Structure 1
């Protein structure tokens, strides 16, 4: 109604790219000799993938749209992308895959925040 269809499309594409980035990054950190120091990073990637996957699906549905549901789901996705971007950024010096995943998390956080701002 008042919603930016382009910002909605961007959010959906970002959630799918970020979910896959975090799935791949959990697996990549799992395979590091350093894995013992990367456990919060792996766990946060797992959460971030689960929430981005759910958010992409909810935002993809227009039938019987409920702003309360959509707002609460975007907030959850913003919050986990922010936490996961921070955690991967701390591992960025130990692995190029975490630098890349941190960028994905930050990009998706911004896409959720931009949509959130428009209601």
Structure 2
């Protein structure tokens, strides 16, 4: 897909990462809201905050990875590393409420899946 500098990149891995980022951003926005409406909250504040970060970073990553013109591997690697890191953190935080709140079980799966997609694409941008 387009420039020589993106020669040898897995276009399927790029497509999977973009779809995973958009699904994971929406999952995290939905999960921050679901935790907000739980008669519990108070105990879910780090979870809500991490959901908000994870939605913001997945949104930005989906946009950066969607652009081929004037591709810069340094920018793309740094953005993928940020998204991998926040997805890992948000997956772990949501998994802690997997039994207390069904929304966090589903969101934990979304974060873990997007973490894997970012890591797989990052590993191939050498």
In structure 2, C-alpha distance between the alignment counterparts of 1:32 and 1:96, rounded to whole Å: 11
Q: Pick the structure with more helix per residue.
A: 1
Runs of 4+ in 1 over 4 A off after TM superposition: none
The normalised TM-score by structure 1 is 0.99
Shift of 1:2: 1.2
Shift of 1:93: 1.1
The normalised TM-score by structure 2 is 0.94
In structure 2, C-alpha distance between the alignment counterparts of 1:44 and 1:94, rounded to whole Å: 17
Q: Which structure 2 residue ranges, 5 or more long, are not aligned?
A: 1-6
Task: Specify the SS of the correspondent of 2:96.
Answer: helix
In structure 1, C-alpha distance between the alignment counterparts of 2:63 and 2:29, rounded to whole Å: 17
Of 51, 54, 63, the residue aligned with 2:60 is: 54
Shift of 1:19: 0.0
Shift of 1:28: 0.1
In structure 2, C-alpha distance between the alignment counterparts of 1:85 and 1:46, rounded to whole Å: 13
In structure 2, C-alpha distance between the alignment counterparts of 1:114 and 1:92, rounded to whole Å: 25
Q: Which structure 1 residue ranges, 5 or more long, are not aligned?
A: none
In structure 2, C-alpha distance between the alignment counterparts of 1:96 and 1:45, rounded to whole Å: 15
Q: State the Cα RMSD in Å.
A: 0.3
**Equivalenced residues, count:** 119
